[model samples]
Target: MWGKKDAGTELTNYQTLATNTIGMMKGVDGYAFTSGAKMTDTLIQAGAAKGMTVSGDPASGSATLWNSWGGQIVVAPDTAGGTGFNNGFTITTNKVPQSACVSISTGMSRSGGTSGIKINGNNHTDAKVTAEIASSECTADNGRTGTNTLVFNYNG
Candidate 1:
């Protein structure tokens, strides 16, 4: 799944042939042809291969997840009152240049109702990424007391 051709190759070939309807024998560029399933499996394998571990659920308290490839995604959940760590989900990472290229897709949902979600930060300042899931029903003064589920997609 990381070498053979697929639908993309056919499209590229068609384009090349259409340009020169004569003796055109252009070959596709060489690159790893990984399928979606293959890529997912690869990531899982790579993480395991690097001896990476996830301490707790993303929605839980502070937890760290990392691999040997200098890859990491630390989650520090925050609660309301700006005191406890529970109404919001904060993300941190391994402060490495390679990590800059990584993409972290976050998924969140509240068990109570829809709320506002925000991710703040332009760079790695303690690798801190704050995601606030606050509902309109619950104001800042009273503090938001709701359950929020968090999930993540790494290196996508």
Candidate 2:
């Protein structure tokens, strides 16, 4: 986070600036330290923070397994002949089942997959959709290969 300027404090003597810069030395006490020395000891004392773990069973290629769809979002390519709001936020596409252009295939053993979209909502109006794929998979034999359209939308 950026700090705000102190009232009229932006004007400081060069010497004062130097002094304050060096003054941070005493602030070392506030840091994670050991025996007044900051070194591997501190690192060992404080275990490395764990990285973030994404939610959802990625192995399940169903839309349900995808990142939640809400807020400002974007779909790309527009090759599926998607029209109107769906083209922007709601894609009522002719490319039913799966848009014949854009896709994201990911899995472990499978090493392939397929994706699709479904929308049950109002036309030219704000609507909420809970979409999941009826058939999404990437077989080791066939391998994942397909072209599809991408749509973009947003929730503010």
RMSD of each: 20.0, 23.6
Model 2 per-residue lDDT at 37: 22
94-140 per-residue lDDT for model 2 (tens digits): 22123211122111012211123332232322222211221343222
Runs of candidate 2 with Cα error greater than 4 angstroms are 1-141
Put down candidate 1 lDDT per residue, 1-156, tens digits, no spaces. 322323223223222222321112111232452122222223333432122344554343454555354445544433235443223333444322311111121112212122222223222212222124222222344332222222221110
* C-alpha local distance difference test of each model: 0.29, 0.23
Cα error of candidate 2 at position 91, Å: 12
What's the distance in Å from true for residue 44, model 2?
A: 37
lDDT of 2 at 81: 46
Q: Mark the 10 consecutive residues where model 2 has the least summed lDDT.
A: 100-109
TM-score of each: 0.24, 0.16
